[PDB]
């Protein structure tokens, strides 16, 4: 999950 | 005018719609180097990478990767280097890029810790008695002075190439009151901040590109750069009327992806550009007014 | 309360942020059948598909695919079938699903042509002298009557199983003034429309699921269903306080993807739910007021 | 291009 910004 | 258009979209409430047309219309180029299994730990976000054609290459022999993009702007005559919030393992690279690209200013549009989550490494020193040394890239960074305001801070750091003992002054503009997926407090605060950066001589052609970053180097970064490039053009053609922001934005999304992350950041960009021209078009008072409005105390 | 939270997000301007937390938090399940090369022409949008676990299957022997999802709501005790705007080749399927699922109402939250682009096939007849026959699925559809208002229209269509000459009355609620990636005119207009649907007896447990659609069956559709399910719960526990919309939404995005497409549609959902409770909590006048406010003339 | 909604 964590990894994303968009 | 854009003021006409803004007035129009506002009335129709077509910000999200207009922004998806932009999203659907943006370019898409490879980001092959960004996804190399080896460059994995060099990227803060899985979904935000530089296009290969525009990525900045470290003059490092080892690996030349850094999630950063060169936004070169033809008509505007201005270039910016947008990048992510450096990681613990990439502050050496970030500073290396600043050295090699010969940048004079750094615009940090985010805070290291935002809403309980880390967004960027403490890549510069907070106290003058504690310089940093990036061993991998052989550079030393030291805090010479700061100028803390309500919502922003300018720092004069000194970076040295340990390898040649050559040294440089890097102005750091830190915008601390612009939330992730959020907008600046008002056109006043933003415009007041841009102009500070502008006067520093940092956005000046005699230096390498200003390095602008946020957590991913696309939302607040696209917004910062969009507003500034549009004001540039309006001046370059001091016939503001002919400036299409959506198009400026689309030209910018050719160099790096997702420049401008939200419809409201898009709406904000308009407000900011519209207000700005008041000054460019001639109004003096306005600048001095932004300062007041920005409550920089 | 959510009214507290709404008041809070509004003040912070955290709509886009809060909505990305929702976007980042939504489920993700396979949509393998949707991507079969054969089902390609059965999908309006490349990027909007039903999860296999919740997709609706046509009791067709041939192919059983239709881009539609069964949103079953445990606590709320309500189920909706969200689907895309049928294509020229899938109106037979759409009507087949309505027949097999035993739906009584259809909520069209979009217009066939929106901003120069087609969004949905004319899947029902506009004049009573011209019924439609969906040859593939062996059904006949006829317009019995309409009730045109300012911004919406209710039609009483008659659908027949040519195969058994059995016939049924399908109420059609067509919301014509809700733009793609946009919000309803005001909580009044929306709430006035929901309640019309509610009174029709269409959202009633004695029938199959109401089929709700827009162009993709996720934005305006998620918004419609979000607001209604939340009001359901608030009643089911006539202790409104305990209703978390973001959570209702997350439970809903387990059955179909992207339910609620924009931050403002999310903000709208709050306004609508908050206003609604005024009525559920007891206020009579309010309903009658929405009608006035909705300018349904 | 056309195909997308998101």
């Amino acid at each position: 999950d964590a990894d994303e910004y968009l | 005018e854009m003021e006409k258009e803004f007035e129009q979209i506002d009335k129709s409430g077509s910000w999200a719609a207009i922004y998806q047309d932009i999203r659907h219309e943006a370019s898409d180029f490879p980001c092959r180097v960004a996804k190399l299994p080896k460059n994995k730990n060099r990227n803060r976000y899985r979904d935000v990478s530089p296009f290969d054609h525009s990525r900045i290459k470290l003059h490092q022999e080892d690996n030349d990767y850094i999630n950063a993009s060169l936004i070169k702007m033809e008509e505007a005559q201005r270039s910016y280097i947008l990048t992510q919030g450096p990681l613990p393992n990439t502050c050496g690279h970030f500073w290396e890029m600043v050295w090699e690209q010969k940048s004079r200013g750094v615009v940090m549009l985010n805070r290291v810790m935002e809403k309980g989550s880390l967004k960027c490494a403490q890549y510069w020193p907070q106290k003058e008695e504690k310089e940093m040394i990036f061993e991998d890239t052989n550079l030393k960074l030291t805090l010479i002075s700061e100028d803390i305001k309500t919502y922003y801070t300018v720092r004069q750091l000194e970076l040295e190439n340990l390898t040649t003992q050559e040294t440089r002054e890097i102005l750091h503009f830190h915008y601390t009151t612009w939330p992730d997926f959020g907008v600046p407090e008002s056109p006043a605060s933003f415009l007041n901040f841009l102009f500070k950066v502008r006067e520093s001589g940092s956005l000046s052609p005699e230096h390498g590109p200003v390095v602008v970053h946020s957590s991913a180097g696309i939302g607040r970064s696209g917004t910062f750069c969009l507003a500034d490039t549009c004001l540039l053009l309006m001046d370059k053609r001091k016939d503001p009327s002919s400036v299409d922001i959506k198009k400026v934005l689309l030209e910018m999304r050719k160099f790096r992806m997702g420049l401008i992350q939200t419809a409201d950041q898009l709406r904000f960009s308009y407000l900011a550009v519209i207000e700005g021209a008041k000054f460019i078009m001639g109004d003096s008072s306005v600048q001095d007014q932004w300062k007041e409005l920005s409550h920089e105390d």
Side-chain angles (χ1 to χ4, degrees), chain A, chain B:
Chain A
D1 244 80
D3 243 340
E4 45 176 312
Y5 177 90
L6 267 22
Chain B
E1 49 233 295
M2 72 172 55
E3 188 171 2
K4 292 189 193 197
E5 188 190 358
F6 174 90
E7 234 70 304
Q8 198 246 78
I9 306 178
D10 239 28
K11 62 75 178 164
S12 33
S14 308
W15 285 104
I18 283 252
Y19 175 60
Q20 232 47 41
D21 290 353
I22 279 161
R23 280 187 155 182
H24 284 185
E25 198 171 2
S27 330
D28 186 18
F29 300 111
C31 300
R32 256 97 27 128
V33 177
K35 311 300 304 195
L36 260 11
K38 74 159 157 177
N39 288 328
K40 166 157 198 168
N41 80 319
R42 295 195 171 200
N43 290 308
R44 193 184 277 281
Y45 299 102
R46 187 178 69 225
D47 53 355
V48 180
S49 313
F51 291 143
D52 302 303
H53 84 96
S54 58
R55 87 187 179 87
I56 294 279
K57 288 172 190 159
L58 304 167
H59 303 164
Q60 177 187 339
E61 236 297 67
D62 182 48
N63 189 319
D64 68 1
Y65 188 68
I66 190 180
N67 185 330
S69 288
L70 174 66
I71 283 49
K72 189 162 172 184
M73 297 296 280
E74 192 158 88
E75 192 174 14
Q77 291 305 305
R78 188 160 282 155
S79 276
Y80 318 90
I81 284 185
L82 299 218
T83 186
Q84 62 180 214
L87 288 158
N89 58 311
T90 62
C91 302
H93 308 144
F94 172 96
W95 287 104
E96 187 189 337
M97 169 180 79
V98 174
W99 188 270
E100 296 164 354
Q101 294 318 312
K102 293 166 171 82
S103 303
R104 188 256 187 321
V106 166
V107 182
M108 174 167 186
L109 298 167
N110 66 114
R111 254 142 80 259
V112 165
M113 200 79 76
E114 287 164 342
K115 292 170 175 181
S117 333
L118 298 180
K119 319 305 273 288
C120 178
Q122 182 57 234
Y123 62 87
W124 76 89
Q126 290 150 294
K127 43 194 48 219
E128 27 277 78
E129 335 93 46
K130 315 176 197 171
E131 341 73 272
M132 312 185 43
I133 267 124
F134 301 99
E135 219 160 292
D136 55 322
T137 50
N138 217 22
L139 294 157
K140 185 187 213 197
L141 187 67
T142 300
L143 186 76
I144 299 315
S145 47
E146 319 174 76
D147 181 12
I148 303 191
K149 320 270 192 338
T150 327
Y151 69 106
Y152 79 87
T153 310
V154 189
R155 303 166 178 90
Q156 146 181 9
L157 308 168
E158 171 185 285
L159 179 79
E160 189 190 318
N161 192 339
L162 296 169
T163 290
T164 65
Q165 276 181 106
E166 194 196 326
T167 215
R168 287 172 194 184
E169 160 158 308
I170 313 286
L171 297 175
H172 193 247
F173 301 87
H174 185 179
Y175 204 105
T176 67
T177 65
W178 190 341
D180 202 10
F181 255 58
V183 289
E185 305 100 299
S186 65
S189 300
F190 175 79
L191 292 170
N192 175 51
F193 182 78
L194 211 210
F195 288 88
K196 254 248 164 156
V197 190
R198 270 186 192 223
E199 290 160 9
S200 65
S202 285
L203 294 171
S204 296
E206 56 267 51
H207 305 122
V210 68
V211 170
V212 181
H213 84 64
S214 44
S215 194
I218 60 185
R220 294 166 269 185
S221 294
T223 308
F224 177 81
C225 303
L226 183 50
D228 172 61
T229 273
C230 286
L231 297 168
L232 246 40
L233 299 178
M234 291 203 203
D235 229 32
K236 317 289 185 160
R237 69 185 64 164
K238 295 204 197 204
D239 141 48
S241 179
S242 41
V243 176
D244 196 339
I245 304 171
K246 296 167 297 177
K247 182 178 184 195
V248 184
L249 181 47
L250 285 173
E251 176 69 37
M252 287 197 186
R253 330 238 297 189
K254 299 190 166 143
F255 299 93
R256 187 170 175 84
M257 51 111 128
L259 304 187
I260 286 183
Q261 286 300 285
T262 80
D264 202 42
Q265 290 180 352
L266 179 59
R267 181 187 187 259
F268 186 85
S269 316
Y270 270 65
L271 293 172
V273 177
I274 278 169
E275 187 57 10
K278 283 181 180 185
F279 159 90
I280 259 66
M281 299 305 291
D283 188 322
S284 293
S285 63
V286 62
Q287 162 124 30
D288 338 307
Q289 318 189 61
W290 301 332
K291 185 158 67 185
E292 300 284 44
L293 297 183
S294 69
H295 303 152
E296 58 170 28
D297 292 298

